[model samples]
Target: GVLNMIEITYIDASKNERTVTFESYEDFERSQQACLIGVADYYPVQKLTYKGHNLDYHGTYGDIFFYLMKQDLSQYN
Candidate 1:
């Protein structure tokens, strides 16, 4: 049986809201981690936290991405 499917929402640098869905828990975790790393690289000033967190910010893709990654999706299961 399928365990859970998670949906993540965020805004891009263009100020457009976007979302990505993961059909499995593993995929969601992996993809979010990768995205967090990329965002961290782009925004060196912002620290990334693993703790449990989206919205749009103009010209701040990294900030939005970071916010999305910090969210806990396990509750959707």
Candidate 2:
């Protein structure tokens, strides 16, 4: 499930400082949408969110090996 209220901030541990708070649901949605559509046509992506649930649908546009090599495999590993 997606977070009820997602907050993103950058914390500088070295300086012991924090700045730039994102506190709106709409902003989070917009950011997620941007991520889903920002890639090249080599991959297709879709973002879905409903009732605090968020999921990503991504399709390969080329060879399986190439796709696998370019993707993060920790989830399946």
Candidate 3:
């Protein structure tokens, strides 16, 4: 299966005109997940309220990645 090219846009809070991009969806998701886990050594909230529950933002990224991978690799006949 061929992976679709993806772009990630992140606005710099201090620099209103600045933005960052990721090469692909996987890269963006991985980076976001890592950030949520404080893997970069910076403390940040890892979960957010969604549907009356605290969603594991870090783990959710992994779930999304796996779901997409599965769909992309599924046998098509």
Candidate 4:
């Protein structure tokens, strides 16, 4: 199986821009859940970028979850 690359762009507590690359969907899910729990507890991920576009994270967790689910991983693979 081929691993997909999930690129996440966010701002930290210090207001610094940070980008994280996940090589697996599970890892991406874990990180997403952690963010949903609490930005301070896990890490502050302000937004998600796919194909050079920012995802909407201001909505509910389910909204973001579905947005992520709808992404085409094959492109990253």
Candidate 5:
């Protein structure tokens, strides 16, 4: 069995967040210093609705708001 997939989803009421694994989650904070555009290059990510947000600001719902949990993986497998 050699299935391959990266687990990512939202753990919220409406689920519009891009909740991801520990490695990916860190890509938004710590290691992001290497390149600010890293997420855009590799993330199918960031489809949230804080509402009325303009492109003038550099931000993402995943960058601040999210649910960090891997418990869903037990069911995912």
Candidate 6:
């Protein structure tokens, strides 16, 4: 699918690596929260890609959110 997606590679509840995809930025943020205290423990994100950009996913919160907020999502809106 050519549709722009927010791909987040993170450590899931099991502490193993996992990749999840989201269609909307809002959902992406939610998934990021899941990396912390969301019914289960998850680790910081390993990698993130969205809007045709290879983001610097330093495995922390707000980095992805800041990037998302700084970018223009005109087409999606």
Which predicted model would earn the best lDDT? 6
Tens digit per residue, CA lDDT, model 6, 1-77: 43557777776667788766778777877776666544322268877777555676574534556667776767544
In model 6, how large is the Cα lDDT of residue 75?
56
Could you tell me the TM-score of candidate 3? Answer: 0.31
RMSD of each candidate relative to the true structure: 8.2, 12.5, 10.1, 5.4, 12.4, 4.6
Shift of residue 6 alpha carbon in model 6, Å: 0.3
Mark the regions of model 3 whose C-alpha exceeds 4 Å error after superposition: 1-15, 37-77
Candidate 5's C-alpha lDDT? 0.35
lDDT of 2 by residue, 1-77 (tens): 33443322222324332322224446654654565452222433232222333333345322222443465645533
TM-score of 1: 0.39
Each model's lDDT: 0.43, 0.36, 0.38, 0.58, 0.35, 0.64
Supply the global lDDT for candidate 3: 0.38
Model 4 score (lDDT): 0.58
Worst 10 residues of 6 by lDDT: 34-43
Residues 1-77, candidate 1, lDDT per residue (tens digit)? 33234444444566555644566556755765676365423332222212211222233324544554565645532
Off by over 4 Å in 1: 1-4, 33-36, 39-77
| TM-score for each predicted model, relative to the true structure | 0.39, 0.23, 0.31, 0.45, 0.21, 0.53
Error of 1 at 12 (Å): 1.4
Segments of candidate 6 deviating more than 4 angstroms: 29-42, 61-63, 70-77
Ranked by lDDT from best down, the candidates are: 6, 4, 1, 3, 2, 5
Model 1, residue pairs in steric clash = 53-70, 53-71
Q: lDDT: which is higher, 2 or 5?
A: 2
